[PDB]
Amino acid sequence: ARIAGVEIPRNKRVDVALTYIYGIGKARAKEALEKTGINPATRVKDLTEAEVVRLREYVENTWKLEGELRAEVAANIKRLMDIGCYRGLRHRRGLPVRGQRTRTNARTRKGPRKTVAGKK
Amino acid sequence: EQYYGTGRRKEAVARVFLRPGNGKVTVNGQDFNEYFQGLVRAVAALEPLRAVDALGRFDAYITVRGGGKSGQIDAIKLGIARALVQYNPDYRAKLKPLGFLTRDARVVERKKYGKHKARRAPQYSKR
Amino acid sequence: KIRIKLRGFDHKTLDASAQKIVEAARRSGAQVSGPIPLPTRVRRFTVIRGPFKHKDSREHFELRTHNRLVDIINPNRKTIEQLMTLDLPTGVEIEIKT
């Protein structure tokens, strides 16, 4: 059922299926499935409405989530522009942020490739 | 009462005492099938007996340590065999044709410098 | 009950110099639990042969401490004589214990 934000998992274990949220990892899922006492191996497909809510409430209230987050991070990085620290440009200049080479690799933070010529 | 052999196999040493009668086999203070559990080949370690027809009319007590489970498996195999030549001179004339008596000389050959791994050299690109 | 250690680089002259201590403790002492050889402590160095880039082709050097142990159960001053002084070690160390 609809847990977080405008969210609906399905037809798989709840532990796994909880995962399908932005902010719910494999760790926060264990934590929730015992601090509200729901066996994890059950398929969503068949679980109490008593339990869909005891989940719902735990989750939205324990922590920041599903696009509240997407906006927070969004809002963080736009601050790293500030007056302008290092990590700022870097984000501004779409380059690796955490002190690692750019001569080779840096593919994950760069557009496929952008080949040219050279060498004589 | 007692008999002995010392099986060895690639860092693995096999203290083996047989005794007549039963069929049970204690290995490092455990039944054979508790130590070698699922390990499909172990049934071979007691192949030397099936060779002489002493099928399972010895017991045997066995310490075996050093390295490897399957190396141990073969180690024992040498004891179980080196034990019965020393409880019958003529236990020989039909274990040689099958050669449960050779040590098995083979061992982790050494890592040489410049190679990756003893023999495996690295990767030549040429241009 | 005497427990004397013998460390060394030279294998041949522990078994030499400290098997005078299996005589001069048998002739004027009595009982001897023979030399017991403790496993060696090998210290390997590995150097690239040339002064420059030839990262393959190296040489191997090992400096090995041979460890030897002696126990004798008749502690007299009948013994602390040749075993006070009467020498042939020259690059050995010894730990004297009881």
Binding site: - | - | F45, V47, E59, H60, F61, E62, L63, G91
Partner: protein, 60 residues
């Protein structure tokens, strides 16, 4: 600068992080074994002479 340098590496310094080994023979910053104070070079050297006690050529 190798002179003013060999000396400065004998001193004690503002902050002990700035310390370091240095082939006491062949005055050398890199690959200086701790049990010798000796650049792998000025070393393979002595080793070969025998000026290094108990150090043999390894073989297995």
């Amino acid at each position: 600068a190798r002179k003013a340098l060999i000396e400065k590496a004998k001193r004690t310094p503002k902050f002990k992080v700035r310390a370091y080994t240095r082939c006491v023979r062949c005055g050398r910053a890199r690959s200086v074994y701790r049990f010798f104070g000796l650049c792998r070079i000025c070393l393979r050297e002595l080793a070969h002479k025998g000026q290094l006690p108990g150090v043999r050529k390894a073989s297995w």
